[PDB]
Amino acid sequence: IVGGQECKDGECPWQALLINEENEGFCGGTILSEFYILTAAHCLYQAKRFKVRVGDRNTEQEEGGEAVHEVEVVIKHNRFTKETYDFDIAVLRLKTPITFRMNVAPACLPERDWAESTLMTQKTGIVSGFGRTHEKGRQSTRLKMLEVPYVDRNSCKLSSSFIITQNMFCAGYDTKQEDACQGDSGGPHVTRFKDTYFVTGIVSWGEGCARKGKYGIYTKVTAFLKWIDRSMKT
Amino acid sequence: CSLDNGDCDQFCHEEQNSVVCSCARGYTLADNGKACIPTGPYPCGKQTLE
Ligand SMILES: CO[C@@H]1C[C@H](C(=O)Nc2ccc(-c3ccccc3S(C)(=O)=O)cc2F)N(C(=O)Nc2ccc(Cl)cc2)C1
Numbered sequence: 001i002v003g004g005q006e007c008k009d010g011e012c013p014w015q016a017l018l019i020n021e022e023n024e025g026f027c028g029g030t031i032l033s034e035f036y037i038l039t040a041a042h043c044l045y046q047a048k049r050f051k052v053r054v055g056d057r058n059t060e061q062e063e064g065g066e067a068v069h070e071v072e073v074v075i076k077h078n079r080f081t082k083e084t085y086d087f088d089i090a091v092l093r094l095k096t097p098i099t100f101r102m103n104v105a106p107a108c109l110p111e112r113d114w115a116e117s118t119l120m121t122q123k124t125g126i127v128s129g130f131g132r133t134h135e136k137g138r139q140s141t142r143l144k145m146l147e148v149p150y151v152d153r154n155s156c157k158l159s160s161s162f163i164i165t166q167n168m169f170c171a172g173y174d175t176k177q178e179d180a181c182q183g184d185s186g187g188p189h190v191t192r193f194k195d196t197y198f199v200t201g202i203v204s205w206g207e208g209c210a211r212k213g214k215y216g217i218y219t220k221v222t223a224f225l226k227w228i229d230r231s232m233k234t
Numbered sequence: 235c236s237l238d239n240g241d242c243d244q245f246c247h248e249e250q251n252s253v254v255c256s257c258a259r260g261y262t263l264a265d266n267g268k269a270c271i272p273t274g275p276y277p278c279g280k281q282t283l284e
């Protein structure tokens with residue numbers, strides 16, 4: 001996350017971190033339930049084997065509230081293509097259930113029509129992660145969050161060098177130096193409504209980070225609600 | 235549902251030209267048919283205090 005603020009105690013409880021063999025974070029995820037994690041499909045082709053850590057806020061010192069979970073089933077959307085980055089979504093079924101506690105809680109999955117009419121029409125959403133704090137910077141040690149404005153669809157289709165599909169949406173700032181970045185991918189994009197946070201996007205991609213005239217691209221969760229529901233039953 | 239989300243805490247539907255509120259998993263609709271009450275500890279979408 002470039003810019004933004006540090007997630008304080010209990011502020012981003014749905015954040016999950018995908019860790020490789022070196023126990024190093026490389027992508028984010030969103031806690032959907034005690035057994036399921038939502039992430040980006042491209043994050044899978046980015047590591048041999050991996051586990052999921054929940055409850056962490058500082059990858060350095062050990063708080064004691066952190067918990068690691070092995071993945072039992074990986075459900076990657078069959079239409080995802082590195083060629084277009086379309087259908088960038090995946091669901092992970094954990095081998096053991098997550099124990100909700102301070103800094104560990106699921107984000108709510110909204111209903112499609114309501115989400116499109118009430119959530120995505122909101123002024124802003126919130127993105128979070130342990131990603132780089134600078135385009136060329138390094139992986140963040142502390143979990144950060146950033147309020148990102150929803151961007152007009154035509155406005156960002158023009159701003160993108162690549163095709164923005166109906167399964168994607170843009171959020172962020174045109175010139176302001178705040179945006180998600182590498183390392184945040186697969187993480188949560190949530191929208192607050194009456195003090196309740198609903199998952200609305202999956203950090204997907206962008207041309208560089210916080211670059212002028214460019215926005216952050218996210219997978220539109222509403223476009224996959226049925227797919228997610230089906231993945232969570234099998 | 236176009237007027238302040240039908241006064242619903244969460245989901246709002248306009249069935250038979252009438253507001254019908256509903257909630258996400260882990261919540262039960264209150265007696266007033268509008269508020270959503272957590273069915274237990276750590277309801278979805280809520281920042282944690284303890
Ligand atoms: C250079 O960017 C650097 C490196 C990396 C990256 O891989 N970008 C990245 C990915 C996918 C496409 C793309 C999309 C459609 C069709 C074809 C392509 S293609 C032929 O693969 O080029 C474009 C891209 F720039 N990046 C981020 O992902 N950063 C970031 C992530 C999320 C958000 Cl919310 C904001 C920022 C910053």
Ligand SMILES: [Ca+2]
Nearest residue numbers: 058061062063
């Ligand atoms: Ca820690």
Ligand SMILES: [Ca+2]
Nearest residue numbers: 173174211214
């Ligand atoms: Ca920008």
